[PDB]
């Protein structure tokens, strides 16, 4: 059968059999690649599910986004977006991938997911993954604002600056890390405490307080603490 005929038969089957959590968590990636393989499939299938019986949608993409999210785990759809980002932004495949993720982002907005709801879906268990550009950017779309995105990830760490900084410093050691954006997240923490007008040594202890064993991530080190203490020291005196 043609590519469309096969691809429809596959998606219906996966949503029909209700298979394993990890089996879904894998099969979604294969389906995603088959979608962006050639450009004239997203719209065509998005046209097919639009006409099929069910709830109405404002666009073909929403019709396809709803079908995919319902079929595989919604938390799984998030992983497939993160793991299938092509290199060249101007290629055909990158164009298709953007159509998929934007539809899912708009689909989540219409369901009224909070900032925390998106983050919990994105979450992979490694606290540095959130600051990878392929994940951070997709977060921004789902929340429209970096401050909220930073706030959402800050609260997902239980409002722990120590755990927060450990992640952002570990994101400074990535081959494709955007310094300007990662700085904004690093900066963002500061004016939250500058709005608190905390004393520098207190700010040290405030950071050092979570350095204790009150809470499975990688803790900071005292030397870089002082620089962070030094970093905040003069800027907001």
């Amino acid at each position: 059968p043609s590519a469309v005929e096969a691809l429809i038969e596959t998606i219906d089957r996966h949503g029909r059999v209700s298979l394993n959590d990890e089996a879904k968590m894998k099969k979604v990636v294969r389906t995603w690649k088959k979608l962006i393989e050639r450009d004239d499939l997203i719209g065509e299938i998005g046209k097919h599910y639009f006409e099929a019986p069910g709830p109405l949608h404002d666009t073909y993409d929403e019709a396809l986004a709803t079908r995919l999210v319902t079929t595989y785990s919604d938390r799984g759809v998030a992983r497939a977006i993160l793991h299938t980002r092509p290199s060249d932004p101007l290629s055909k495949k990158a164009g298709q991938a953007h159509r998929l993720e934007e539809a899912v982002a708009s689909l989540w907005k219409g369901r009224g997911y909070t900032s925390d709801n998106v983050v919990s879906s994105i979450a992979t268990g490694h606290d540095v993954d959130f600051f990878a550009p392929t994940a951070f950017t997709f977060l921004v779309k789902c929340v429209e604002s970096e401050d909220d995105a930073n706030n959402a990830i800050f609260e997902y760490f239980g409002s722990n600056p120590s755990r927060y900084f450990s992640a952002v410093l570990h994101a400074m050691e990535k081959p494709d890390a955007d310094s300007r954006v990662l700085e904004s997240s690093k900066k963002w923490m500061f004016q939250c405490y500058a709005q608190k007008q905390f004393p520098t040594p207190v700010f040290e202890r405030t950071l050092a307080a979570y350095q204790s064993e009150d809470y499975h991530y990688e803790k900071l080190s005292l030397s870089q603490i002082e620089e962070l203490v030094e970093e905040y020291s003069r800027i907001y005196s």
């Binding site: 319902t70 938390r75 369901r111 009224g112 925390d116 709801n117 050691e173 494709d176 310094s179």
Partner: protein
């Protein structure tokens, strides 16, 4: 046992049988043993059991063999097992004629007759039938053989040959993923065609071509009259081959000898193969064919083989297949990552398809092996038998150099290349592993004839061109990098070497065996922190050049002596940096020769600090270089092709000289957040892809483009954009989007010139007053999105000209007032006019609309022409009071939305038929729900105050009764809502599972036992949600169900194994109910487990269910 011997002891146990026993013993054959004390008049059960499992039997026949009822019964059982089971029976006619056995005559017949007196009829019949059958079968006539010992030796040899062939390929079934190859190859075969189809198999060396061929021959050859397999033809061929005809003749001779099993005869001429095999089904496998000579030797024409036959040649370069004209080719693909791990663990942990103990270094080694089954096998065999610390100490050596097992096989294929092909291979391995073919041709075009080299390498399967870029397998790339140290590159005769090594180049740079000319390419990867910059001071004084620099800087730390070292080079060709970590480019850097320049992450500000000359430059990529204020004078850059300022974010303005970039094709200022204007481009620019996605500060634009070839023009956010550049011809607008590009005013009239623009968006384009009148000029325009495009008070009447658009989404256009009227759109699927607060007049385009959505409008009228429109799958209107005078509207409606305030409870809804859905937004002042019509599938009350009574027993179908926030519900109404039988959810305001559901609990578990003998049972389930910060707008929930026993472990089935809704509200103090069917009849064993998919959203709290 091995063999079951049957004989008559009194005749042969002494003379001949002993010799056969001795021969079998010396040949490693262990026949079943018996004793004369171990025999009764009958045979016994254990004797038959021994016979049945012997899997081969030898019936030695003598003169008085028939004179023992014991022996006759043994023979009868032997024949019975031969006919039923696959037992193989061999016969020895010890000086007795087979005809005498057949007709029961002679002395043998006399003994048989004397033995047959007294027996019942069926015994005699079975004895005679067995005797006849054993006389028929082909054995060994002792009389024919001149030499008894030779006959016994021949019998032993035949027994041995027909004993080491029972188990077919029982071993080495531990090879992974062969089913995919078999299925993908069956389509090529199409054995049903009865043709002589040729089939090729090709791929990089070390994928499994030989193994795939062996598996296929093992599986299919039994279906062919005459089948043979030739192995490693390339290796077994004379390398100089001074007489091609003699080697050709001997190759065909080997093929025929192994073909007919015809004992290595000698062949007269080259046409014999046709003479023999043009009239028989033949399956032939030719492995590792290198050049057309072997193909001409073995299979030159289709007509060489009988009607219906398959010949399959496995090669390594496509050119050989193509020359012979095959066109039925399977390009063998790499196995999946899981299959790769299975192969590696098979070869490393001793038949364990999974790992053992640790499962950590295994995946590092696997990833090191790429995906070649050869690489996986070699690494697994190298690592097997060790322990974890031994693995860890062997790992770095394995990583820094590839095993000689892989190296030799790769080297053999590498040596079969032309010299320029070898040079291109080295170039790709060292520098351009993953680059566009066009850039490779542009950079290496004056050396190697890049196009032909790439064509040959792709044919040889030493490289693959996926999409527009080349890719070489990492295992092969490592070989290339290694050979780059023990080999040179020549162009006319100048000797070159490529420097590739992670910080292991620095020693080579600190040398005096130096030329300043040997090295033209550098590929440096600097991920780790620097201990000290290992370059010496003296080498900094050198003037050595490089025509290719590619540095993957990866840290915040800055390299200075490396910079000073590279920029001494007078004529660089291509420059690649990542994380340049410096403010400018040094002034002593010459760029007259510079074809490609990319610094994909940088801290460059106002680089070059003055004008330079850029004669042959064709690619500039300053992406992500956020700390970049402006850009140098691009005058005299006429040959520039593409410029990618991807996400520079501090580019205040663009140089005025952009006018002179005549050859420009691609202009990508994606985020580029600091831009204010965008200067005019010129006349012959012909921009092909113009991307400005989120230029939030971009205000001005050029007045014109000259967009003769403009595939894509994207301005997604671009919030403050007043006007828009005109367009000339737009003959190829593959893509134009302005999603949320607010603060626009108009649209250039030339937009209608785009004859092929299928899709078009303006969602969010607020403050857009009117569409251009030329929109109708567009053709193939299929999709037209407009959403909350307020202040669009018109719609041009030329739309009727379109005649192809399927859907026209026009949502939230709060000021749209009229629509064009005297229009019929021949194919218009939907028309989504929601919340068009001032539409005020029914949209009448007399068409074949199937989905009409008119909610929140202000039409308050329905025309009479609508009966001309026979099908409507969805006609949705917001209820106004004066619908009652439009009886033509009622029967052709689907949905309805009562307003914020409707006291009346409309009985008319009973008459009106198609009510797939009915929605009640707000309506706090509503006495009760209206009596539901027979066709009701959906009921929604998103917010409500009083719904005391629901006076209607409705039982249409799988109906959804959603009541998100309505507490004044009478008990009978509530009970009706729970106890209505449906196949979907039903959701109520409640704070506790109702007592109606007896069996209660709080990955949660529900336990109950059922009172029934044997039936299919039906269950009603009730679920609350864990108290969380549920969003008021949360609108999505799916639930999975698992039912299982504890007396047994039978995971039973459950017909509605899931319930999903994309519109149900998710809230805390609410009751969700649904229904289940179970059919398996493990009586007193019921355990339920309801899970909420998306635990990040909803988690199941309390739970309680009921039976029926």
């Amino acid at each position: 046992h091995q063999v079951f011997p049957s004989f008559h002891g009194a005749d042969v146990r002494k003379t001949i049988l002993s010799h056969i026993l001795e021969s079998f013993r010396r040949k490693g054959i262990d026949p079943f043993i018996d004793n004369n004390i171990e025999r009764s008049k009958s045979i016994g059960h254990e004797l038959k059991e021994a016979i049945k499992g012997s899997k081969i039997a030898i019936v030695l026949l003598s003169k008085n063999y028939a004179s023992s009822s014991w022996c006759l019964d043994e023979l009868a059982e032997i024949m019975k097992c031969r006919e039923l089971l696959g037992q193989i029976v061999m016969t020895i006619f010890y000086e007795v004629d087979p005809t005498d056995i057949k007709k029961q005559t002679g002395e043998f017949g006399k003994a048989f007759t004397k033995t047959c007196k007294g027996k019942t009829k069926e015994y005699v019949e079975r004895w005679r039938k067995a005797l006849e059958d054993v006389a028929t079968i082909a054995g060994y006539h002792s009389h024919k053989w001149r030499n008894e010992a030779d006959m016994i030796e021949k019998i032993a040899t035949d027994v041995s040959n027909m004993l080491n062939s029972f188990k077919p390929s029982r071993d080495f079934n531990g090879l992974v993923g062969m089913r995919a190859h078999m299925d993908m190859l069956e389509q090529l075969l199409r054995l049903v065609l009865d043709e002589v189809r040729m089939i090729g198999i090709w791929g990089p060396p070390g994928i499994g071509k030989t193994t795939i061929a062996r598996f296929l021959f093992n599986q299919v050859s039994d279906r062919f009259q005459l089948s043979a397999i030739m192995v490693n033809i390339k290796g077994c061929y004379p390398r100089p081959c001074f007489d091609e005809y003699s080697a050709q003749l001997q190759l065909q001779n080997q093929m025929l000898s192994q073909m007919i099993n015809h004992k290595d005869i000698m062949i007269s001429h080259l046409g014999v193969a046709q003479e023999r095999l043009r009239d028989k089904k033949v399956f032939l496998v030719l492995d590792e064919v290198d050049q057309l000579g072997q193909l001409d030797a073995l299979a030159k024409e289709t007509r060489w083989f009988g009607p219906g036959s398959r010949i399959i040649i496995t090669t390594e370069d496509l050119g050989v297949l193509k020359a012979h004209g095959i066109n039925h080719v399977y390009k063998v693909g790499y196995p999946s990552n899981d299959e790769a791990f299975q192969i590696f663990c098979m070869n490393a942990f001793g038949q364990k398809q999974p790992h053992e103990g640790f499962d950590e270094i295994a995946r590092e080694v696997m990833a090191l092996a790429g995906e070649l089954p050869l690489g996986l096998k070699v690494l697994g065999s190298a690592l097997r038998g060790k322990s974890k610390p031994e693995w860890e100490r062997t790992l770095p050596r394995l990583k820094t150099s590839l095993d000689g097992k892989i190296g030799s096989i790769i080297q053999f294929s590498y040596d079969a290349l032309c010299d320029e092909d070898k040079y291109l291979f080295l170039y790709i391995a060292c520098l351009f592993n993953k680059e566009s073919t066009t850039k490779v041709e542009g950079l290496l075009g004056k050396f190697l004839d890049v196009r032909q080299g790439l064509h040959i390498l792709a044919q040889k399967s030493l490289i693959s061109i996926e999409d527009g870029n080349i890719y070489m397998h990492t295992l092969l790339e490592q070989f290339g990098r290694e050979t780059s140290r023990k080999q040179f590159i020549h162009h006319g005769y100048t000797k070159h070497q490529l420097l590739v090594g992670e910080r292991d180049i620095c020693e080579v740079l600190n040398d005096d065996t130096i030329d300043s000319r040997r090295f033209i390419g550098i590929n440096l990867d600097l991920y780790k922190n620097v201990e000290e910059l290992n370059i010496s001071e003296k080498a900094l004084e050198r003037i050595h050049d490089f025509q290719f620099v590619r540095i993957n800087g990866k840290n915040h730390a800055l390299h200075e002596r490396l910079q000073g070292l590279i920029y001494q080079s007078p004529q660089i060709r291509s420059l690649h940096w990542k994380c340049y970590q410096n403010i400018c480019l040094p002034s002593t850097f010459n760029s007259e020769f510079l074809v490609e320049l990319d610094m994909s992450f940088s801290k460059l500000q106002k680089l070059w600090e003055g004008t330079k000359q850029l004669r042959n430059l064709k690619w500039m990529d300053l992406s992500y270089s956020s700390y970049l204020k402006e850009l140098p004078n691009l005058s005299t850059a006429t040959n520039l092709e593409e410029l990618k300022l991807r996400n520079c974010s501090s580019l205040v303005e663009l140089p005025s000289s952009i006018e002179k970039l005549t050859s420009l094709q691609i202009l990508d200022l994606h985020r580029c957040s600091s831009l204010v204007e965008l200067p005019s481009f010129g006349n012959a620019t012909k921009l092909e892809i113009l991307n400005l996605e989120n230029c939030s500060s971009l205000v001005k634009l050029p007045p014109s483009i000259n967009a003769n070839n403009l595939q894509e023009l994207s301005l997604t956010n671009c919030s403050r954009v007043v006007e828009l550049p005109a367009i000339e011809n737009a003959t190829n607008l593959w893509k134009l989007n302005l999603l949320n590009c607010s603060s626009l005013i108009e649209l250039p009239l030339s937009i209608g010139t785009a004859t092929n623009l299928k899709h078009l968006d303006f969602r969010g384009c607020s403050s857009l007053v009117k569409l251009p009148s030329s929109i109708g000029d567009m053709t193939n325009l299929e999709v037209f999105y407009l959403s909350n495009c307020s202040n669009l008070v018109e719609l041009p009447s030329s739309i009727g000209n379109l005649r192809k658009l399927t859907l026209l989404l026009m949502r939230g256009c709060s000021k749209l007032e009229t629509l064009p009227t005297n229009i019929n759109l021949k194919s218009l699927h939907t028309l989504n006019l929601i919340d068009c607060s001032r539409l005020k007049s029914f949209p009448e385009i007399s068409t074949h609309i199937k989905y009409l959505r008119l909610i929140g409008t202000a039409i308050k009228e329905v025309p009479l022409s609508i009966m001309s429109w026979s099908p409507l799958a969805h006609f949705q209107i917001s209820y106004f009071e004066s619908l009652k005078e439009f009886p033509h509207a009622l029967d052709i409606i689907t949905e309805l939305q009562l307003s914020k305030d409707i006291q009346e409870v409309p009985p008319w809804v009973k008459r009106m038929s198609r009510l797939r859905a009915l929605r009640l937004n707000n309506c706090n002042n509503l006495v009760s729900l209206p009596q539901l019509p027979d066709s009701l599938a959906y009921l929604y009350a998103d917010n409500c105050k009083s719904l005391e009574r629901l006076d209607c027993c409705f039982n249409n179908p799988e109906i959804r009764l959603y009541f998100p926030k309505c507490f004044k519900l009478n008990q009978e109404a509530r009970d009706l809502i729970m106890h209505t039988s449906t196949r979907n959810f039903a959701m109520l305001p409640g704070t506790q599972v109702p007592a109606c559901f007896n069996h209660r609990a709080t990955s949660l578990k529900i336990k109950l036992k059922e009172s029934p003998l044997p039936t299919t049972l039906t269950f009603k389930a009730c679920i609350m949600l864990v108290n969380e910060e549920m969003s008021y707008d949360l609108k999505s929930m799916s639930v999975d169900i698992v039912i299982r026993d504890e007396q047994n472990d039978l995971k039973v089935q459950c017909t509605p194994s899931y319930h999903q809704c994309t519109e149900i509200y998710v809230l805390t103090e609410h009751i969700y109910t649904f229904e289940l069917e179970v059919e398996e009849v493990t009586s007193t064993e019921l355990v339920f487990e309801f899970t909420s998919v998306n635990e990040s959203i909803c988690k199941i709290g309390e739970c309680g269910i009921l039976q029926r």
